[PDB]
Design a protein around this ligand. Structure first.
Ligand SMILES: Nc1nc2c(ncn2[C@@H]2O[C@H](COP(=O)(O)OP(=O)(O)OP(=O)(O)O)[C@@H](O)[C@H]2O)c(=O)[nH]1
Ligand SMILES: Nc1nc2c(ncn2[C@@H]2O[C@H](COP(=O)(O)OP(=O)(O)OP(=O)(O)O)[C@@H](O)[C@H]2O)c(=O)[nH]1
Ligand SMILES: Nc1nc2c(ncn2[C@@H]2O[C@H](COP(=O)(O)OP(=O)(O)OP(=O)(O)O)[C@@H](O)[C@H]2O)c(=O)[nH]1
Lengths: 54, 51, 34, 438, 99, 105, 49, 427, 438
């Protein structure tokens, strides 16, 4: 029982470590989110440089 | 309008409607027509057979 | 459930007088408690 | 011989049956492939699995259960799961159209065309089986596809096959939680249709299942796997008599004959006492007395019924593990001496003991504790009528303002059927106090 | 990285093989009974009692090799993601320049 | 379609797993006399004189229950709620259930 | 009884190392595919120069 | 299997589906060219609910685009995803609408309804068995209202056994630009309530405030607004395509929604809206999600139902959640505002949880609402119609087309009958 | 001894006989060239082929069948196939003019000048034969060249040889599929000519042949190769009693004596029980009990008939492979007790059992299963009249408006033959009802 409980606690710690890294990776995506960053580069979906996407 | 009371009357005299006898075959077997399936229908029911 | 209608009428009056005191929505459960 | 068949209706009934069969393959040591190791247990299908699996000369343990569904969504990934090779492909009844929570839609629109197929599955299961004591029906009262489809099948299996038992298992509607408001529509429709046909209906409620776990299992964050783990343990415990012997063996036939007092009401309540965390099991001691106190402690029941608000008729205890007749008979004798426990004066004895040598096992990657002495508490009390009493005031308001009927009358019913169930219920409630009256 | 992964594959494979044969022979031998055949008298010996290993140490070996493979697979996944990102950036820069 | 003799344990639903009784059987025949005339021509065609089964066969609320103790008025309907359905009282595997119970006072 | 215990103990490790070799092979195939993709990109690189 | 064929209407819709479809392709990992990149197994099999198969692993959209002006179609064709759309699906006319409702409903429609019905039945026979259809259009849109009201009527008798999902944007209450727009809207809704089964209500002014509230980016593009609504309509459709212990059919949802047949208008609700610092200042927890889910600012559809009461509510949760939190959160809100619901229905909450997170966030949700807040919407347009019909402004055009005032009489009367419907139920 | 001759008429009959002969060489291992390996089986023509092939001192197995056709296309292409060296050139009776789907055009215009040549084939085959029990006529009711030509040959072989059996096999017209609208015309013409001469006619329908192909064989895209493989297996199974022995051996005479109740009607139905995909056969098991139910399962019949709509008269089961008397005699006893099985009370006994030890073999590049226990189920029931009843209400319409007759009377007929055939069918229906009446 104790050994099962001891390893049960370890799974808790690991999934804490697992759920933590999910947050920072989630934070990273929001940082690079194009909707958030609103780059003026992807607005030129037109073929000719003299013409823009309205 | 007591359209509340109408809805009662609407469904009170709503009678009912009918389904259609259709069957299926397989795992993802489709809705194969039972009605006049040509397989298990009531075909011999007309005053023309034999006589 | 009752064998005799006399016991049926005997039972109902016994619970009718004991209606309000008894717990449960139908007032058959037990008041109990100290 | 001694075997039975399991049925899983409603998209909720399939994930729970999955876990149950997942649980069942452990104690037999079943590999996911479908075969044992080079060890010799295969044959014509006769060993511990013969009651449950069908491992013929092909060597593949074929479970004796049919999973029925109306939506391809939840039934396909299980067909792509880990044990899908074990499952018979056309035993996993799928559909392409839903019942839309509508009893009648499943009961009329789609029920006709699929029941004939499953009836074929039933008969080709029936021919291969030998004694086939009864059926294991896994469903749900708020069955999105369970409600209508279970009703029609249990009608058809009752009318053609009436000489055996039919064991019913559904989640009881949550008293104060409702994920659907058409749920009362079909739930009462299911109940009134099932009262005159169902043999043994056993209910359960998820809220108290959750309430238990963060009480003593101490997990504030369980999962359906945890929920399915507990209920799968329940059905495992009751089938341990089939799986294992003991001082005495009992069967569902005894369960039916001895539990139900009188017709109509056939709705006992299950319970499992040694519910505790592994750590709390680790540095504490288990014996018959405290679990006998725990099993009858009012907060250990998954159904929201204050047992003191009602009175008991029957109580079945199924001790699985290392127990002796001495303490248990003394302990239950003390239970009879207790005053707060109020069986009806009608029954002198209402206790059906089950003894099984086998200590129940833990599941790898599981959450339960390691138990040596277990007990399952199937019991019936008069404290249950409040639930249907809760339903009627819920329903009586709704039907007076007749919400959602435009759908139901829209696809082919009338109001007479809805009328019948209410005096059907009014019969059940009025009967409940009459038998409750001594 | 390919080379390293294949080497680790081979090592774990050979150990798996060995446990396979030992398990098979153990099962085959276990079927013995007192009255049946395959029953022979020999003299005793000391290789009967030769000492080379202990179960906990054997389990240590197995777990360590498991960890080796685990870490190498982690590194492979990381490298693959890095390669994909590099490709993305390269393509974008070339596009802008030509425009 | 008859029941055999003596060894009447090797042919039962015990192996059939039959949950609707197969067919009533018997072992008794009245001593038949009769030159057993032929009453057709070549086709099963009964000579108009002799009679046949005159086109008799050509080609849910019913359930097992005992009346036991459930209110008489409810029970009375149940009897009617069992019968009045020849589509389930006549043929085609039998279609016919049983009944029991006891009256009230 | 002792022999049976030892046998089941062996069977466990057999199972997990089976599965472990399996996913190793799968991941090796995945890096095969990605390496080939990089090779194709390098092939396409040349013309604009 | 069951599937859906989509209909693309209105010039606003021409943007709507464009953003809506590219989100799906990017969500499922298909390139703009059309060659899917096998990355997630689950999205591979359940792509046939919306897309058919083309050669070379190309997933053809089963949607139909319809308009009158070639330039917009040329633009959407020249977009990053115009190639995935089919020249077959590009049906249109060679005329200018004047964005006149009657012209798009009686004059220009007559010679195109034949052609467009052929395309849909061609697509309908291309598939086996549908749930139904959904339409992206506008009620205040001149050409979209004219075409859709015609198409919805025709498809009704065609398939009276399916789901006639409708997606329309409500114009800005403060300003409509189009001055005859209330005429266009009131005409359309008369048939719409007659024909539709489900309808979403969307307002730009609320979207404008949301940009001021959480986007905080001052100057967006209209497509950015479309990105939001496309995410919402994607989220509700995620339940169909993705696994998880939640039931998917809109009818399964619909049978959980509509107390009485005239309830077709429903309002959306969406998942974490976050600003610059709050992305790294948010502890993503089901409580704070649920708190944000029922925020008076988080709503975007029409207006605040703080004024009215809540008839039926349904929130679908996309991510790694469990029954317990949504249960207690539902209890918390139930105890939070017990009186704010209606005594006519208790337990008016309908819950579903999707176990498959979106690509970009883990724990998300979507809300669809049925409350008593729509009264403000059509009471506004009620006087709008009366004031303009008081002196029949801009009416010679419709009479020249062949329209008469009597058509307006029942349209407003039917509208008025529905207004009395909402209150006398609730009040 | 124990031998027969096969005939393949109609351009449909030409591929099917080829595949049967293609099958037949496999179980004897015959090489396409015409000779066995260095192993010794040749002689004066006396071995397992002596009933099927004529492998004389020349050493070449010569199949004992004649392929008759009226269009050179298919007959010449098989003459350039793989086994064309085995076949007899002018046994492949070719024609230069078609019957144009017209029965009488095939029956009168060209059949006169060709039958005499075919008769020479018959007598030159007849003289060399020794036992010559009967013939294996492969045709089709909608015979584009089969209908007319098979009728005339059957007449001439009936009149000259009336002392032996004639076994007929035709694809029954598809009940809901008509690839020709003259197909009824000639079909009824074929029926009325054959009723008073034909010995045993066995039909089958393609639509249901496909129906299993994707049901249990799981092929949504099979071809005639699979179809001819199925029917080639069927005729192989019935000839296995000739090819090999078993617990008991049964001859075509016994079937004929035991199948036809009363004259005219000689039209039973064929069905083969162990029809399943290879992988489904892989992890499952076969025994007599389940295959008994499947062959009598109503959807397993290749004819669009509900046995519950009719009543049984004859049923024949032929078990090819490893079986034992104990289970089969018990298993059939189960079927006699079955309630759905409604035999006519005229026959307390209505079963003919054939036991053959030989396990049916697979064909290389085939799609069949791996069968050890096999049974082909030949049966006759009253549920067949609907098919002819389907034809007459079809036929009566067109005949009332006399469509296409301008051709038939144009090239030499009148309405009298059409007139005669209809009351014969009307006789058959009332006969079918009079037998149906007890
Ligand atoms: N026993 C059990 N019940 C569940 C589970 N998940 C949800 N439920 C409840 O059981 C009910 C199942 O009924 P339905 O929702 O109609 O499910 P269904 O009939 O199989 O098909 P759907 O309508 O598509 O959902 C739901 O309303 C839930 O409240 C589960 O995992 N196990
Ligand atoms: N495409 C697009 N439409 C918008 C935008 N903002 C508001 N809309 C409205 O969305 C409505 C629907 O478009 P359609 O139905 O195609 O328009 P229409 O029928 O040609 O008539 P109009 O309303 O005059 O354009 C239009 O009426 C616009 O008023 C926007 O930013 N882009
Ligand atoms: N048994 C069998 N039937 C076939 C095959 N191919 C097509 N059929 C069907 O069998 C029928 C053959 O009858 P007919 O068309 O009259 O053939 P025929 O009498 O030999 O001569 P034709 O008039 O030239 O075709 C056709 O109508 C097809 O529907 C095949 O390969 N084998």
């Amino acid at each position: 029982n104790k050994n099962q409980v001891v390893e049960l606690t370890e799974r808790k710690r690991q999934e804490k470590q697992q759920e933590q890294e999910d947050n920072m990776t989630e934070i990273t995506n929001l940082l690079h989110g194009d909707l958030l960053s609103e780059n003026p580069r992807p607005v030129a979906s037109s073929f000719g440089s003299h013409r823009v996407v309205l | 309008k007591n359209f509340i009371n109408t809805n009662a009357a609407d469904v009170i005299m709503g009678v009912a409607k009918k389904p259609k006898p259709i069957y299926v075959d397989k795992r993802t077997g489709d809705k194969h027509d039972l009605e006049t399936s040509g397989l298990f229908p009531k075909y011999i029911n007309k005053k023309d057979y034999g006589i | 459930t009752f064998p005799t209608e006399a016991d049926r009428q005997r039972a109902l009056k016994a619970h009718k007088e004991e209606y309000a005191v008894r717990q449960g929505t139908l007032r058959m459960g037990n008041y109990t408690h100290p | 011989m001694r075997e039975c068949i399991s049925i899983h209706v409603g998209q909720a009934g399939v994930q729970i049956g999955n876990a149950c069969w997942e649980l069942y393959c452990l104690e037999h040591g079943i590999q996911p492939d479908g075969q044992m190791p080079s060890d010799k247990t295969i044959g014509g299908g006769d060993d511990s699995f013969n009651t449950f699996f069908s491992e013929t000369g092909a060597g593949k343990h074929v479970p004796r259960a049919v999973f029925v569904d109306l939506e391809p969504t939840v039934v396909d990934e299980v067909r792509t799961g880990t044990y899908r090779q074990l499952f018979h492909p056309e035993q996993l009844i799928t559909g392409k159209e839903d019942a839309a929570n509508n009893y009648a839609r499943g009961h009329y629109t789609i029920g006709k065309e699929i029941v004939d197929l499953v009836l074929d599955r039933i008969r080709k299961l029936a021919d291969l089986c030998t004694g086939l004591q009864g059926f294991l029906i896994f469903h749900s009262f708020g069955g999105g596809t369970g409600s209508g489809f279970a009703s029609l099948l249990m009608e058809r299996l009752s009318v053609d096959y009436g000489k055996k038992s039919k064991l019913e298992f559904a989640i009881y509607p949550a008293p104060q939680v409702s994920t659907a408001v058409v749920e009362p529509y079909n739930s009462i429709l299911t109940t009134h249709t099932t009262l005159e046909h169902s043999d043994c209906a056993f209910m359960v409620d998820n809220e108290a299942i959750y309430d238990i776990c963060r009480r003593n299992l101490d997990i504030e964050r369980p999962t359906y796997t945890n929920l399915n783990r507990l209920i799968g343990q329940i059905v495992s415990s009751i089938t341990a008599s089939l799986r294992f012997d003991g001082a005495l063996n009992v069967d569902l036939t005894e369960f039916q004959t001895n539990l139900v007092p009188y017709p109509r009401i056939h709705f006992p309540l299950a319970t499992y006492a040694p519910v505790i965390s592994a750590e709390k099991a680790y540095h504490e001691q288990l014996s018959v007395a405290e679990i006998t106190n725990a099993c009858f402690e009012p907060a250990n029941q998954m159904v929201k019924c204050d047992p003191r608000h009602g009175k008991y008729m029957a109580c079945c205890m199924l001790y699985r593990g290392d127990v002796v007749p001495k303490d248990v008979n003394a302990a239950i004798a003390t239970i009879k001496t207790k005053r707060t426990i109020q069986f009806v004066d009608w029954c002198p004895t209402g206790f059906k003991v089950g003894i099984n040598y086998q200590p129940p096992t833990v599941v790898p990657g599981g959450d339960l504790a390691k138990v040596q002495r277990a007990v399952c508490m199937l019991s019936n009390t008069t404290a249950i009528a409040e639930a249907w009493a809760r339903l009627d005031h819920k329903f009586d308001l709704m039907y007076a303002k007749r919400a959602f009927v435009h759908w139901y009358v829209g696809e082919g019913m009338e109001e007479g059927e809805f009328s019948e169930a209410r005096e059907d219920l009014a019969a059940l409630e009025k009967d409940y106090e009459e038998v409750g009256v001594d | 990285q390919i080379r390293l992964n294949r080497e680790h594959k081979e090592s774990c494979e050979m150990n798996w093989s060995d446990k396979v044969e030992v398990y098979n022979i153990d099962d085959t031998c276990s079927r013995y009974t007192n009255e049946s055949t395959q029953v022979q008298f020999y003299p005793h010996s000391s290789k009967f009692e030769e000492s080379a290993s202990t179960p906990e140490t054997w389990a240590k070996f197995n777990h360590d090799n498991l960890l080796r493979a685990e870490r190498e697979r982690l590194a492979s996944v990381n490298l693959r993601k890095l390669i994909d990102c590099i490709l993305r950036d390269t393509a974008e820069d070339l596009r802008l320049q030509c425009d | 379609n008859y029941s055999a003799n003596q060894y009447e344990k090797a042919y039962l639903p015990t192996y059939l797993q039959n949950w609707s009784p197969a067919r009533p059987t018997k072992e008794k025949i009245a001593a038949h006399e009769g030159y057993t005339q032929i009453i057709a021509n070549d086709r099963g065609h009964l000579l108009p004189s002799v009679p046949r089964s005159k086109a008799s066969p050509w080609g849910i609320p019913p359930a097992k229950v005992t009346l036991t103790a459930r209110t008489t008025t409810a029970a009375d309907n149940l009897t009617k709620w069992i019968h009045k359905n020849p589509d389930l009282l006549n043929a085609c595997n039998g279609l016919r259930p049983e009944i029991s119970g006891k009256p009230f006072d | 009884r002792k022999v049976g215990e030892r046998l089941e103990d062996m069977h466990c490790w057999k199972s997990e190392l089976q599965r472990e070799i399996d996913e190793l092979s799968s991941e090796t195939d995945l890096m095969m595919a990605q390496k080939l993709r990089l090779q194709r990109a390098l092939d396409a690189t040349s013309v604009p120069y | 299997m069951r599937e859906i064929v989509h209909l693309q209407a209105g010039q606003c819709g021409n943007q709507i589906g464009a953003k809506f479809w590219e989100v799906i392709s990017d969500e499922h990992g298909i390139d703009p060219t059309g060659t899917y990149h096998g990355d997630s197994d689950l999205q591979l099999e359940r792509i046939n609910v919306y897309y058919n198969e083309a050669t070379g692993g190309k997933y053809v959209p089963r949607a139909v685009l319809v308009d009158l002006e070639p330039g917009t179609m040329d633009s959407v064709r020249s977009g990053p995803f115009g190639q995935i759309f089919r020249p077959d699906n590009f049906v249109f006319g060679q005329s200018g609408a004047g964005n006149n409702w009657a012209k798009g409903h009686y004059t220009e429609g007559a010679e195109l309804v034949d052609s467009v019905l052929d395309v849909v039945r061609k697509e309908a026979e291309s598939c086996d068995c549908l749930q139904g259809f959904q339409l992206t259009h506008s009620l205040g849109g001149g050409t979209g209202s004219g075409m859709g009201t015609l198409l919805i009527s025709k498809i009704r008798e065609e398939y009276p056994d399916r789901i006639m999902n409708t997606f329309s944007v409500v114009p800005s209450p403060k300003v409509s630009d189009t001055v005859v727009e209330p005429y266009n809207a009131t005409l359309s809704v008369h048939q719409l309530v007659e024909n539709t089964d489900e309808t979403y209500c969307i307002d730009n002014e609320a979207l404008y405030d949301i940009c001021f509230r959480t986007l905080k980016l001052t100057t967006p593009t209209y497509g950015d607004l479309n990105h939001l609504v496309s995410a919402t309509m994607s989220g509700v459709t995620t339940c169909l395509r993705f696994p998880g212990q939640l039931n998917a059919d809109l009818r399964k949802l619909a049978v959980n929604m509509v107390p009485f047949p005239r309830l077709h208008f429903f309002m959306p609700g969406f998942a974490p809206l976050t600003s610059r610092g709050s992305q790294q200042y948010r502890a993503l927890t089901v409580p704070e999600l649920t708190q944000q889910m029922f925020d008076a600012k988080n709503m975007m559809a029409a207006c605040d139902p703080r004024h009215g009461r809540y008839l039926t509510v349904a929130a679908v949760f996309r991510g790694r959640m469990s029954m317990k939190e949504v249960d207690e959160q539902m209890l918390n809100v139930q105890n939070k505002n017990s009186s704010y619901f209606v005594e006519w229905i208790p337990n008016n909450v309908k819950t579903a949880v999707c176990d498959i997170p979106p690509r970009g966030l883990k724990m998300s949700a979507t809300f669809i609402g049925n409350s008593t807040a729509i009264q403000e919407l059509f009471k506004r347009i009620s006087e709008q119609f009366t004031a303009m019909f008081r002196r029949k402004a801009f009416l010679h055009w419709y009479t020249g087309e062949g329209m008469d005032e009597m058509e307006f009489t029942e349209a407003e009367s039917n509208m008025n009958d529905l207004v009395s419907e909402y209150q006398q139920y609730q009040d």
